[PDB]
Design a protein around this nucleic acid. Sequence first.
RNA 1: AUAAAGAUGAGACGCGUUUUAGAGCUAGAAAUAGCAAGUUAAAAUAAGGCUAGUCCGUUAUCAACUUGAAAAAGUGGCACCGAGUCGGUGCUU
DNA 2: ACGTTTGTACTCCAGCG
DNA 3: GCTGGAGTACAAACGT
DNA 4: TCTCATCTTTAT
Length: 1150
Amino acid sequence: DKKYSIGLDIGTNSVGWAVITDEYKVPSKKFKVLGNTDRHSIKKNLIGALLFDSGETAEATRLKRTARRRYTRRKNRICYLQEIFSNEMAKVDDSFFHRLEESFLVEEDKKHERHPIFGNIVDEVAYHEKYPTIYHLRKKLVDSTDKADLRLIYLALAHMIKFRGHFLIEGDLNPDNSDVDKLFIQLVQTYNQLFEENPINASGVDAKAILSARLSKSRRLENLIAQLPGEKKNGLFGNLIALSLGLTPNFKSNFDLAEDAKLQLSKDTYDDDLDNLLAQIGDQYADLFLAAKNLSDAILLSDILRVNTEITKAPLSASMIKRYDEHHQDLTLLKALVRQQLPEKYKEIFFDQSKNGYAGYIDGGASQEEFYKFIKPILEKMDGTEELLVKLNREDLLRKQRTFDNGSIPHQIHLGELHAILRRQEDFYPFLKDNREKIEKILTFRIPYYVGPLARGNSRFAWMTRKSEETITPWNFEEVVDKGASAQSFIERMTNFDKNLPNEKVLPKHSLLYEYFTVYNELTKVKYVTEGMRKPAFLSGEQKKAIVDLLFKTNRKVTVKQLKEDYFKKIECFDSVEISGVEDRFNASLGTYHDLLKIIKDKDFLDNEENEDILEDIVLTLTLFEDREMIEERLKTYAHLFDDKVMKQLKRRRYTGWGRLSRKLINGIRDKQSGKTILDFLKSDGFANRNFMQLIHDDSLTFKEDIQKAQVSGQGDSLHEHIANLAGSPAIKKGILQTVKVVDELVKVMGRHKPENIVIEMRQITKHVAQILDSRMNTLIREVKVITLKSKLVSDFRKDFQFYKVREINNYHHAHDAYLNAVVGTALIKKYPKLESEFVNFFKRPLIETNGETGEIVWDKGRDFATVRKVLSMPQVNIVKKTEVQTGGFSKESILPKRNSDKLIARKKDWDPKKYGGFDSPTVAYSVLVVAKVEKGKSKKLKSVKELLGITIMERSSFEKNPIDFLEAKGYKEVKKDLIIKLPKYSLFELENGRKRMLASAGELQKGNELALPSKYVNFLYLASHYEKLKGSPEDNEQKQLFVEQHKHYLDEIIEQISEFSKRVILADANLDKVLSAYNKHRDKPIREQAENIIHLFTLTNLGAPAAFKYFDTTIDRKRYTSTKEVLDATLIHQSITGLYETRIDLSQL
RNA sequence: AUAAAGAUGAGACGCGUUUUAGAGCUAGAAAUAGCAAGUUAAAAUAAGGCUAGUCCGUUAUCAACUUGAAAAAGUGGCACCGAGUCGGUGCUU
DNA sequence: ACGTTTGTACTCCAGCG
DNA sequence: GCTGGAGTACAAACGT
DNA sequence: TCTCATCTTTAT
């Protein structure tokens, strides 16, 4: 029944906790120990920290999952092309697809001839001679008109299908135009033809170098207009140029159209927006936009095709053939020139795969930048290498075809080459003539966003709904999938539910009902006073309705002067009118009413009451959807009510935005007696004219009980689920959840007594922590107080009062920050209970500080300082590393090549790692203690053993299905199930003399002991290493410097401390001897440098993984415990989250 | 109202890696030496799973024991003197 | 006595734009 | 980056 | 690397 308090310091990787008293004294309690060990009770202190690894975002998982989906859909694409080709393929060469399938296989494992394409050596060699790359075949099948083998058509087809490029440019792309300057001259000619008053002169302009330059497109446009004599980027020529490069121009102010009329060529909406602009001004500018489109194609195609087009129909394949030819000629010239001038470095350049020469370029792993960096100094120290250097600075020397520049290739180039192939070979094989649009669709079918993963219901990420029950193919995607419903579900599954009624969706922000609510909610607070009126008056219902029907209904924005004149003096005949409660600018305006009115040109439609639901459906359609036909499909349900032009204007309009207040909140819930909803209340409340918040906070109204009935339904959520819906990074969420369970266990330990302070430090996230812990404790006034502090408030209490924190010494500092937090929070709430709103030098002055009424233990300047120093000097602090089963991916992602090892993991089931390579370095989920008998030696005796067998993440399910069979498959016989112990990572083992080790794997350990350095040495280290510079006053920091330069024996005493603690627990002999030798070597450096590097010295000592530290110039590599045989006969400790509750298992008894 | 950042989800490219294909030639008995060539493709890209889908498979949660279908629940006196990872003393239980 | 096993110290390595 | 896996070279220890 | 949606939080 002793009053207490809890201090907490929450971090991304650590949560510290402590318990304070009113005397500010960490209590010490005896706790019972379970298990089979001799020890039964441990006195432990009520201060400690929990350490864990950081919680990870789901972005990496989303990236991996999207990659898996892309590989599955690509394999489906080759599968579809194979089903198309199969019937004739069996006629010409059966099992060709089979030979391609088993291409990744050795000859011992294949079932056909090793050559994939033709099935014999001679035609394979002849094919590789005729087409050295696949682009040679692609250019041939596009250009030639003779009949070719079906295998070659399929090969080019599947290459085009598998690497089909990007979908960033929507519309059509015509590769026939590729000259930037020719279409620039055409643009100038068309502009001068239409516009004669101010013609544009652009003769003598290097259009190719400007418009295809490598810098940004905005600066490209700026460079272009700077050269232009007397033109503006906002002008017509500048706007056309910006439209050609792709930056969106505004055509409003130039044609004076009063609508934005933005045109972007990469968007499919541009055709209909161009139709809009043609309807606005006429068709005489259509040739100008056509020439702008051609000029855009000239810019966007010359950067990648870089070849003549008048001679071929596949200019990308022509570009790759040209690149191969330049590579061949330049390689021949380079080989001859190196063999002539520098014959010694021919084996390095052309034979050595380890170096970054041409052998490293081709056979090795060297990239293009690395090879250029290697070969450029070689070319400088030679003659006749001017052209090679010219192409090297242009990044066009010895270039590969499958390079990273291929990411900018549109899918239109591959589609056009594919179309050319089908048009050339349709007359010989009729099946491509009959299946032409099928293959073109297979390339150009991309599942849209707003359509979920094409599932049936066993998916957690899917929202897509089905019209039929047929399998979704590339061709019946628009017949099985309801695209409008799926897009609505896409928007709705992420949009919010309103907080008052959690099972109901929100309306769009530009809904007219929300707009009526906002306009009326602002109008009901409108105050006005007139001459002759004693007190100013809430507006009555007819007054507010008249304002809405005149000033609001005519003007988009209504000001105070408009009210005071146009209603109050014009109609109410009051001139001396003043207002309050509102500003000059009304926050709520009825924008959607005016915009929709200007769309339709009808006023009697909207002011009717029975049609408002259909207009709500139009604003829903205009907020949800951003495909044009997918808006038009929903607008076609109301096709009868308006004109064609009206709904083209409706289709053209779009509202982005969602509100937070739903519609059954407004025209829904109603009083049990009156039967009017809150909008009907807000239309005519009476003299009271109350607004929304009180109508949801009125005790007499039944709205209050309905919304609490809505909030109670569902019972909120569980602790982890309520943690999940919060904002912020998942790591801080993990820290908060550990904090909540730490508080729960701390309350449990004390005898189920709750403390009337909980002190927290880490803004809105912290207010949410205060909310959840306040709800957990007080179960509605705050019987338990929750106080949130800041890092500055304790940093000050440490810098001013010599309570410095060297974090590199030990992990006790989280617990000590928590205890301090408790100290200062309780002292502040006792000292100033008036200033609890912001939280829920008093440290001459009285020795026992007091507020003046009940300052009993506010801050006594004696005792309390001594007690806080004793607490911060306490050797025993329960540091707990949270034991975690490691999850994630199994093994490193690198596919290492073939070698004769047992540590290579197979990439499939039939892929023997010695033959096919495989992954390596698996990750253990947890280790298990196996006590069995393994056959040893050639006499195969049942030698009983006790070993740790680490279960990797890939084998966790197989182990947990049946441990006995899995251990017997490993080789352990007569296994004893009752002694199988699940040992996760960070499991603690106490071996001898207090030496504790934490499990890292089945073959490695971590140091698990903490160095409690005497606090005098800690303060001397912090002052001497100048940690956080110097915060004391010049006299005080002068005395601190004197302290530093007079207690220099502390340096050797701390070295003795590290040496003693290392020789007791951290059994690293050589590193400790190097530590002492390097201390003796640098014993003459100034005290600051020495103490800072002694602060570095604690890495040999800190709990966790051993890591390399650096003492001045000497660095020491880590001592690692690369076998776990010692903890097999040690005391295994199971620790609670606070660690006060323990269970010790003596493993040497098993 | 504007901007930035973060979180979550979906749709897409490009590259990398791996095994195989792209008959290497001459002088020798070989070791090896000299020369020629090099730019591409197929397949896989977590093993795999059943619910067999253009699905899912690397996030969050996780001391022990007991009740357990699970979720979840239950399981362990206090005070004082001190401090090298917590120890000792007394009483109740 | 001597031939396989475990410790110890050191090195490199880790899918990305 | 961290930190756990793997290979290598070499010696001490175990076991036959 | 690319495209898109939804939300929140902070600063102005």
